[PDB]
PDB file of C-alpha atoms and ligand atoms in Angstrom:
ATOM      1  CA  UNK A   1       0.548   1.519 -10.357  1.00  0.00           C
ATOM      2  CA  UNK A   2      -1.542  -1.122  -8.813  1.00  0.00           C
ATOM      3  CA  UNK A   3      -4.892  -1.587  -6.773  1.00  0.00           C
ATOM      4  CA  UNK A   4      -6.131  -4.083  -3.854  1.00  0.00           C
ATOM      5  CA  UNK A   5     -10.024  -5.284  -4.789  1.00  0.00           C
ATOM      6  CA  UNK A   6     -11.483  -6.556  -1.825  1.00  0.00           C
ATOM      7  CA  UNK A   7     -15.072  -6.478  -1.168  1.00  0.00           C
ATOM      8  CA  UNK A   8     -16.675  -4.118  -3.152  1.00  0.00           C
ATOM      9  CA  UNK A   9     -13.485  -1.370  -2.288  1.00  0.00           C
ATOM     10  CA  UNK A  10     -10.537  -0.654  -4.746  1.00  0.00           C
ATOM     11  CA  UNK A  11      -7.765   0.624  -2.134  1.00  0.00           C
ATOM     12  CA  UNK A  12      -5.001   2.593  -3.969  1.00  0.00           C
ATOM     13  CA  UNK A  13      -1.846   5.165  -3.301  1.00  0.00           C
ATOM     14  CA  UNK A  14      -3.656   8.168  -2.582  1.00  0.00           C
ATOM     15  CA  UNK A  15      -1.520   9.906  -4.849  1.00  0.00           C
ATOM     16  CA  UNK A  16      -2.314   7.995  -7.854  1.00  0.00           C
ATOM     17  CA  UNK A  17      -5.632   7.544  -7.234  1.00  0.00           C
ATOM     18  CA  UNK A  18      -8.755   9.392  -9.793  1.00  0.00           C
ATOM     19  CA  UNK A  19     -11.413  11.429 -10.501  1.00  0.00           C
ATOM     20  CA  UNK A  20     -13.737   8.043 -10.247  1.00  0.00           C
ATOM     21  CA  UNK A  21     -11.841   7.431  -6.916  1.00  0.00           C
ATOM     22  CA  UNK A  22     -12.704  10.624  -5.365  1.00  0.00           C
ATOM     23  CA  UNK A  23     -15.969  10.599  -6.774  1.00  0.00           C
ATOM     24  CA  UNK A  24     -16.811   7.139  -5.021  1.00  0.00           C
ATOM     25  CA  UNK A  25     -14.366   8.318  -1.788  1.00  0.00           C
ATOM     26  CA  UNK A  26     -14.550   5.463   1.145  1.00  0.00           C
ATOM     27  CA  UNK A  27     -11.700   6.732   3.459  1.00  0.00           C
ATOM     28  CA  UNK A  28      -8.542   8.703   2.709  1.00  0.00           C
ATOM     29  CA  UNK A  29      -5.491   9.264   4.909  1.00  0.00           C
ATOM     30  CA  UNK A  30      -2.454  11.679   3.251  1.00  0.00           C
ATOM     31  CA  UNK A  31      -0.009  10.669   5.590  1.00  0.00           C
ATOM     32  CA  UNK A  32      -0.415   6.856   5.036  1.00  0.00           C
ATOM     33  CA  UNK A  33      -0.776   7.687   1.030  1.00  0.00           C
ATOM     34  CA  UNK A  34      -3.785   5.798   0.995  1.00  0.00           C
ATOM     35  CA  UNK A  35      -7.394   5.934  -0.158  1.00  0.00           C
ATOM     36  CA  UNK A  36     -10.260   3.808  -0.649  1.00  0.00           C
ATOM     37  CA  UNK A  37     -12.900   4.018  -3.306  1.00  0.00           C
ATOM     38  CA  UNK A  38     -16.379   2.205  -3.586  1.00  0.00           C
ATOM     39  CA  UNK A  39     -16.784  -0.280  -6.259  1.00  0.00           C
ATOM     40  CA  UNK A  40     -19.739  -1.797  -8.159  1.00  0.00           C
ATOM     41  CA  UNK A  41     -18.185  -5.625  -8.603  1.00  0.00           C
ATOM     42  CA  UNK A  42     -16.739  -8.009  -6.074  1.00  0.00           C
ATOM     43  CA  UNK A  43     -13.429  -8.184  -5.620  1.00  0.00           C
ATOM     44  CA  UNK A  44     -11.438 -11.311  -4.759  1.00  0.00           C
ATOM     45  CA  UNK A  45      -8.268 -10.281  -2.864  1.00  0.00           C
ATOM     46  CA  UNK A  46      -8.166 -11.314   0.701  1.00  0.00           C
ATOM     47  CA  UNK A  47      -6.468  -8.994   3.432  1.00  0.00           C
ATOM     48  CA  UNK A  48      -3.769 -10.241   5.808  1.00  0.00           C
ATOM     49  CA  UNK A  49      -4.866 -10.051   9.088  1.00  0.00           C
ATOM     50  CA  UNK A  50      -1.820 -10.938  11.304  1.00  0.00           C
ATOM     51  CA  UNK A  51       1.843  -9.452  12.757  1.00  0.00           C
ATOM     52  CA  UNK A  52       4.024 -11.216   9.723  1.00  0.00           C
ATOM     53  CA  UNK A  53       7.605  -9.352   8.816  1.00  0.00           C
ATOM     54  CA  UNK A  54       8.164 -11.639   5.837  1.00  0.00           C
ATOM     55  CA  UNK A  55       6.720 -11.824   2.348  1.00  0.00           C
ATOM     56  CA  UNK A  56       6.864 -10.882  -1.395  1.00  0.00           C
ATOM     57  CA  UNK A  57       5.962  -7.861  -3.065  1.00  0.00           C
ATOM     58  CA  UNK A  58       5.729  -7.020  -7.111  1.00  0.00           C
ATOM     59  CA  UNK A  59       8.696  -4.482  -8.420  1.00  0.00           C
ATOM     60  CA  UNK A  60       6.773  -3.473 -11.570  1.00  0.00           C
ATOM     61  CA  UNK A  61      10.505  -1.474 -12.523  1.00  0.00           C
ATOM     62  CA  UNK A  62      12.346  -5.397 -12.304  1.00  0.00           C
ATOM     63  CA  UNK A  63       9.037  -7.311 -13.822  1.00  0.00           C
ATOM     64  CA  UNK A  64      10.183  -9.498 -10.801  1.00  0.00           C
ATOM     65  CA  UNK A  65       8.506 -10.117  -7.081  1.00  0.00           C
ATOM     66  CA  UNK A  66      11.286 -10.110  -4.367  1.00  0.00           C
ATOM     67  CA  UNK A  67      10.737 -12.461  -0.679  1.00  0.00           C
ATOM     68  CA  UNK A  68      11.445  -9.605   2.023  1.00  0.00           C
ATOM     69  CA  UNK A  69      11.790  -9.213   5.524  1.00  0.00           C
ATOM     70  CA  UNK A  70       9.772  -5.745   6.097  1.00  0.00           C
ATOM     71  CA  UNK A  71       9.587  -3.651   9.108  1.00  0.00           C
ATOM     72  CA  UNK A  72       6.274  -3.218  11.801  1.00  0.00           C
ATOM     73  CA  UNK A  73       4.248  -0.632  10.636  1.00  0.00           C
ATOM     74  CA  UNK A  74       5.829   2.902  11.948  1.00  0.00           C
ATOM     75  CA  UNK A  75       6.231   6.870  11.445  1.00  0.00           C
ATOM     76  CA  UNK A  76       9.011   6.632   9.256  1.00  0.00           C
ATOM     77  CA  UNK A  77      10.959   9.898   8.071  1.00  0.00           C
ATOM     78  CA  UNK A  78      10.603   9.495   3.981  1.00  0.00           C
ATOM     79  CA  UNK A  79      12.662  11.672   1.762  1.00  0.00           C
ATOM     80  CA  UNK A  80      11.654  13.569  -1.010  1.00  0.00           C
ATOM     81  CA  UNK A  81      10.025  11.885  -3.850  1.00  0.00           C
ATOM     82  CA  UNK A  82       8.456  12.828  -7.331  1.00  0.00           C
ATOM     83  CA  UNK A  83       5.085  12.898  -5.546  1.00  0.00           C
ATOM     84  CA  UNK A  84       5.281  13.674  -1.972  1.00  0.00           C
ATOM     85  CA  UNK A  85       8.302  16.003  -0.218  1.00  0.00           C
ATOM     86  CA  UNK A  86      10.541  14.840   2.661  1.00  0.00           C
ATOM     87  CA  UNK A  87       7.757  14.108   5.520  1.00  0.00           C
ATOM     88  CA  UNK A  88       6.743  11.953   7.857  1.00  0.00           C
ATOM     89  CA  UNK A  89       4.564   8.888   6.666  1.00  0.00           C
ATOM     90  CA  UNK A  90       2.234   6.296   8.566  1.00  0.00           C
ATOM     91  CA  UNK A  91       1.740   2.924   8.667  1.00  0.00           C
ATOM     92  CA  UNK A  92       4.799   2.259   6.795  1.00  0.00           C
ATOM     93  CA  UNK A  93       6.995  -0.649   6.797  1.00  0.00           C
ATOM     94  CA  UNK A  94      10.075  -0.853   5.125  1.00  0.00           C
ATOM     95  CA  UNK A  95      12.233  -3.711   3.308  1.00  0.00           C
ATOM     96  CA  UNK A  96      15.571  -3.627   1.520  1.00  0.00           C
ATOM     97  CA  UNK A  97      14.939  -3.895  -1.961  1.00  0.00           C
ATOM     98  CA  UNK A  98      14.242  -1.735  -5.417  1.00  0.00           C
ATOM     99  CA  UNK A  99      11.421   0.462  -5.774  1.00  0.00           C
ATOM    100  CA  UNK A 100      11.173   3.811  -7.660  1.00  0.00           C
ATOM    101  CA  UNK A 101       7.773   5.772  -8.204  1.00  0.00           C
ATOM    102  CA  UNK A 102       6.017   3.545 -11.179  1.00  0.00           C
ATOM    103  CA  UNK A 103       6.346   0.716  -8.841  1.00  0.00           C
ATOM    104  CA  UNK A 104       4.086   2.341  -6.065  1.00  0.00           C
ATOM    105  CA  UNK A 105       0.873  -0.247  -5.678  1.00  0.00           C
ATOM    106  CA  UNK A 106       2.053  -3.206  -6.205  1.00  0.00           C
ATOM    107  CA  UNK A 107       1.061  -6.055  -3.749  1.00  0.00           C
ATOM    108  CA  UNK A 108       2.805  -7.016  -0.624  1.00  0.00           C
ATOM    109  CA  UNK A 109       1.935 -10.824   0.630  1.00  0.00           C
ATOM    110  CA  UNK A 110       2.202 -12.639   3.491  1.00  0.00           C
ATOM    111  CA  UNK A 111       0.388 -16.561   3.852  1.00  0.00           C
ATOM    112  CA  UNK A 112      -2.581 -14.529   4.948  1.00  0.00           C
ATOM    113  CA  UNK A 113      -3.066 -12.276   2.094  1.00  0.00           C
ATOM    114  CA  UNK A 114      -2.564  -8.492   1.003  1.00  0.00           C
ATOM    115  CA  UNK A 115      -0.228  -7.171   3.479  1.00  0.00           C
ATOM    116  CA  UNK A 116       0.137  -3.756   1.970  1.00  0.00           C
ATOM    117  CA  UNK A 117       0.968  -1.820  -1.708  1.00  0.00           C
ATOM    118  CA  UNK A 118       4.161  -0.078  -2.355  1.00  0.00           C
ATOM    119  CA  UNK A 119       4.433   3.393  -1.228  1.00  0.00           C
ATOM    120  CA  UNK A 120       8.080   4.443  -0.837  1.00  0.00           C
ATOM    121  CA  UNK A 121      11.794   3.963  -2.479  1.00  0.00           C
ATOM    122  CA  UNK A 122      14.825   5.222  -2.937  1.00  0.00           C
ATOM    123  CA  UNK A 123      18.339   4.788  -1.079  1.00  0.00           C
ATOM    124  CA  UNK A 124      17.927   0.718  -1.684  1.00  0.00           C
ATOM    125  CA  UNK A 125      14.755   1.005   0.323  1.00  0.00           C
ATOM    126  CA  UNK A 126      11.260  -0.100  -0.851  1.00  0.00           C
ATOM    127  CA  UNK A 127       8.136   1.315   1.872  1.00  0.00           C
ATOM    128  CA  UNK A 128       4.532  -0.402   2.081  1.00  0.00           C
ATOM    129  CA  UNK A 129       1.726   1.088   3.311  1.00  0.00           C
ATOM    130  CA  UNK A 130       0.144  -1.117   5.631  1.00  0.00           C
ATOM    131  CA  UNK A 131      -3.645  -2.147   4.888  1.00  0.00           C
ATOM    132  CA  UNK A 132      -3.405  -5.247   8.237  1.00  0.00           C
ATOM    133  CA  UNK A 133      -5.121  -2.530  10.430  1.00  0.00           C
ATOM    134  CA  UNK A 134      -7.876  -1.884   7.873  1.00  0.00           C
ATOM    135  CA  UNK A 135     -10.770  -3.964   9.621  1.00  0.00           C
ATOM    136  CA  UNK A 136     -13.448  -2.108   7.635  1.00  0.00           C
ATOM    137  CA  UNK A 137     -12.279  -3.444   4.616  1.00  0.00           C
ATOM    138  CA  UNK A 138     -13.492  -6.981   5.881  1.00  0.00           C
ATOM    139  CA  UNK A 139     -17.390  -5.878   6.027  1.00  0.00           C
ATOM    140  CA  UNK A 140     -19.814  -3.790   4.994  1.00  0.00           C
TER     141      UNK A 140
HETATM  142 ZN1   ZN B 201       0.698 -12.821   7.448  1.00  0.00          ZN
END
């Protein structure tokens, strides 16, 4: 599980996100398992806005956060997983590394901020979904 607060938006894997998510619905994009919910407090967490490959992300399953290299943001083939089937997914970038379902939203930084959440794992691959496009989330 895991959330990015920035601004007064919550922006979680659209496949773990709620009733109070959908209720307060921003933007939602299946094949980038993403959504975006309104919130009623400030958040603090900046957005990365930049073109970096390297970082650290949180593996909730490890209690540990890893330094990757991780892939431009692409249409990557994803197999099946206990929430989505084999499909195509946007906006991902991927890093070698652990990552099974429960660690799907934690935090991917760069020096600029929130790069992207976990979204994707399995054969020793871990996916983020990409928030760097995102402008929006910025403003307003
Ligand atoms: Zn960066």
């Amino acid at each position: 599980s895991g959330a990015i607060y920035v601004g007064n938006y919550r922006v979680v894997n659209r496949h773990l996100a709620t009733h109070n998510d959908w209720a307060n619905l921003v933007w939602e994009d299946s094949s980038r398992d993403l959504l975006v919910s309104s919130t009623t407090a400030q958040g603090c967490d900046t957005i990365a806005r930049c073109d970096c490959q390297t970082g650290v992300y949180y593996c909730s399953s490890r209690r540990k956060h890893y330094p990757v290299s991780f892939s431009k943001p692409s249409l990557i083939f994803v197999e099946a997983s206990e929430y989505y089937p084999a499909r195509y997914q946007s906006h991902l970038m991927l890093a070698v590394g652990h990552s099974e379902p429960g660690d799907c939203g934690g935090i991917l930084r760069c020096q600029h901020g929130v790069v992207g959440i976990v979204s994707t794992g399995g054969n020793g691959l871990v996916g983020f979904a990409d928030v760097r496009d995102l402008l929006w989330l910025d403003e307003e």
